[PDB]
Design a binder for this molecule. Structure first.
Ligand SMILES: COc1cc2ncnc(N3CCC(CN4Cc5ccccc5N(c5ccc(F)c(C#N)c5)C4=O)CC3)c2cc1OC
Ligand SMILES: [Zn+2]
Lengths: 45, 162
């Protein structure tokens, strides 16, 4: 369940200034899995 | 009900989705423990997920939320990583499998940094890494992320100590 009169939570990093946000929803119908991306991580050179 | 449409690398949608994946990599404070050590990905495939039922349920909820928030769905495109991506594309996200251990309550997590989502593709904390080699930094095994349309509506701002 979302906080009263909220639809989601924004988890905003306040210590790592380069970290972008995370988000939480409480109903699966509030997201659509639009793109499936298949990938490898690359070993740095 | 789901069909997967392969996007050509020449397709502007392939290119824009790749750029959002690549441009949102960052370093992690675990030094790569959960997700592995990397600055960029090798994108092998991008598929458009097409499911009329799921899309209609999404747009119905989006209209409800918009109406509750001065005609503003606050819709984002965000990454989701978990071992369940092949389930989610067929049946949609299921809030009954909510992340109870998460820092922001028991729900479905998404991330702006693709590399944050990459930390979860093999499970919480990267689990035991890839199925084949048990390597959270595997450079061989194929990984999958979802790039998702997410309605945030009125979003509670929780400052995180991370
Ligand atoms: C086959 O079994 C399943 C089928 C499912 N079908 C649809 N939806 C599912 N879940 C997938 C898990 C979702 C909650 N989680 C769980 C989780 C498990 C392991 C690794 C990561 C996660 N995360 C997660 C946590 C922090 C994060 F930053 C991210 C991202 N990006 C993702 C969830 O949001 C809620 C929706 C399903 C989850 C299933 O197993 C638990
Ligand atoms: Zn492997």
């Amino acid at each position: 369940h979302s906080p009263p009169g909220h639809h989601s939570v924004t988890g905003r990093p306040s210590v790592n200034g380069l970290a972008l946000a995370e988000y939480v929803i409480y109903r699966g119908e509030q997201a659509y899995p639009e793109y499936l991306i298949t990938y490898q991580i690359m070993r740095p050179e | 009900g789901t069909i997967l449409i392969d996007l050509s690398p020449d397709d502007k949608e392939f290119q824009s989705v790749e750029e959002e994946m690549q441009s949102t990599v960052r370093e992690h404070r675990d030094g790569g423990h959960a997700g592995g050590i990397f600055n960029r990905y090798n994108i092998l495939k991008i598929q458009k997920v097409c499911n009329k039922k799921l899309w209609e349920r999404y747009t119905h909820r989006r209209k409800e939320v918009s109406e509750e928030n001065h005609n503003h769905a606050n819709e984002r495109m965000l990454f989701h990583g978990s071992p369940f991506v092949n389930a989610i594309i067929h049946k949609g996200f299921d809030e009954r499998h909510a992340y109870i251990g998460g820092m922001f309550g028991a729900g479905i997590y998404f991330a702006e940094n693709s590399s944050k989502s990459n930390q979860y593709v093999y499970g919480i904390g990267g689990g035991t890494g890839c199925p084949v080699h048990k390597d959270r930094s595997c450079y061989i095994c194929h990984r999958q992320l979802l790039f998702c349309r997410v309605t945030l509506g009125k979003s509670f701002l929780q400052f995180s100590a991370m």
